[PDB]
Amino acid sequence: WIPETLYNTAISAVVDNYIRSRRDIRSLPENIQFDVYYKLYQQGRLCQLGSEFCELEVFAKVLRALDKRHLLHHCFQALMDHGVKVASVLAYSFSRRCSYIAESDAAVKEKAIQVGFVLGGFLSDAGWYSDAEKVFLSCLQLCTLHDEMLHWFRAVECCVRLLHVRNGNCKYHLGEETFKLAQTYMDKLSKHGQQANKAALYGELCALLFAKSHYDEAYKWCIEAMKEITAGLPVKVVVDVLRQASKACVVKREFKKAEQLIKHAVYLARDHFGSKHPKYSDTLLDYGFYLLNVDNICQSVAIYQAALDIRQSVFGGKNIHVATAHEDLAYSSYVHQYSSGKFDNALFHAERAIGIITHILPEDHLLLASSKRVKALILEEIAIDCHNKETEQRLLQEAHDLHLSSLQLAKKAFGEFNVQTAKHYGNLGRLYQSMRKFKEAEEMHIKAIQIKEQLLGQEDYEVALSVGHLASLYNYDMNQYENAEKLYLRSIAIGKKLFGEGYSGLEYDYRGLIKLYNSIGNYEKVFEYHNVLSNWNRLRDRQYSVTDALEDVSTSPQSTEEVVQSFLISQ
């Protein structure tokens, strides 16, 4: 038993005598104010804590305690789970403040922008992108009324941060206009003999174009972003650009460069921010995206779960940042345990993602498309493993509803000619194969091939996966072996080119070819495909060697400019 500090004892006493000194707490120093409000959180007084955090004047002084920000992100979340719309009220209060001080001197206008920047950055970090967009729109208005150098820098920074809150909220049509406005302000800066850094802006544009499945132009723009990283940039900007460049390199099939890019990003986040920071959780999420697309699948679950545990400790439940980790871990656990078939942990993370996103986002929002897809993929694979026909025809019906909802969102946002709506088409083709529907599955798979071939090339990962699905539909279901053989060979060749002989997706193609040749002839091909499958299993015995990717990154691998230069010299 250790005595509590007199600080903590007086914190307990001031809270308990709360309302008699609730207007005197605002006269306290900033750290004391944060400790009082955190004590209101700890005792369960979420009602009074919400009544104080909805005030911008009180919350702005709370935001000044940077070192305890990881507590605030948690406390805020509880308020947003309490039913008190703190973020919306704060954004509306800041918009009212800006509308009131629209006609004032720049010495008080710049103060509200700096208050607006920290509040908008907090709401963007917390994941309230629809509420952080109002704060940044007010800041951009304040920079828009007047025209000078300092207001131009503030407008550029505000359009950079406004692009980020229009990307996580999945409003890309406004995002392109935001980038055009940012480019206009940087052109106005350049015409006055002054150059502002474009690394953060082009990184957010890379995120915008990666979300819109424009992988080629996203790769070009992350090259443009990485061309302008110096030692004077903040660590967060360098980390964000490295993550976006790594993701663009992954979907550009350049797995080699993305290795060093995402590993250096993860190391930079773990060094500057620590192992329990939301930005480090974002880096771990992108690292898991890398490891899942490399076919280093068994490691990737250990990285999403590490990303989820940070996002579940810094942020409470019912948050989009913990929901994205939920939907990404649910997919990877579905991918990692696809052969095993124990979709118990995968379905729990999938239902937690939709159970959050449906609560904090509208029904027509695009994050449901990436969350309903994962749950429907897990549900379809679960029902083909259970022997109850009345349960299988219910789970496949539910997965049909979720695929149609995801397809509707993808077609409404990206249009009918896009990679996202095409992988939704391919998922519907797999589901229709599971539904014993033959012609509809064939049409869905042909449409998926048609859209995923032109927008990704003839030898991409996703198109190879859809070719494998169509080959399994022709082989195991429709008995169209003349085309199924060619499709299986194409899928095997593409998987061998991108991944090698240790690709985990080659087993479902080798067994398909084995069955096809079993039921068409040429048994000399069957024996050698059994030999090749045995060789593949022996190679996967060594490729299955589990390590820790947090030790693969190790400590101090390269330098900050070294990774950028190595990525740049290889085009």
Binding site: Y334, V335, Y338, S339, G341, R373, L377, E380, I384, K423, G426, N427, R430, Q433, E462, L465, S466, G468, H469, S472, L473, Y476, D477, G505, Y508, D509, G512
Partner: peptide
Amino acid sequence: LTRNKGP
């Protein structure tokens, strides 16, 4: 188990 994982 006749086909690969969903995209």
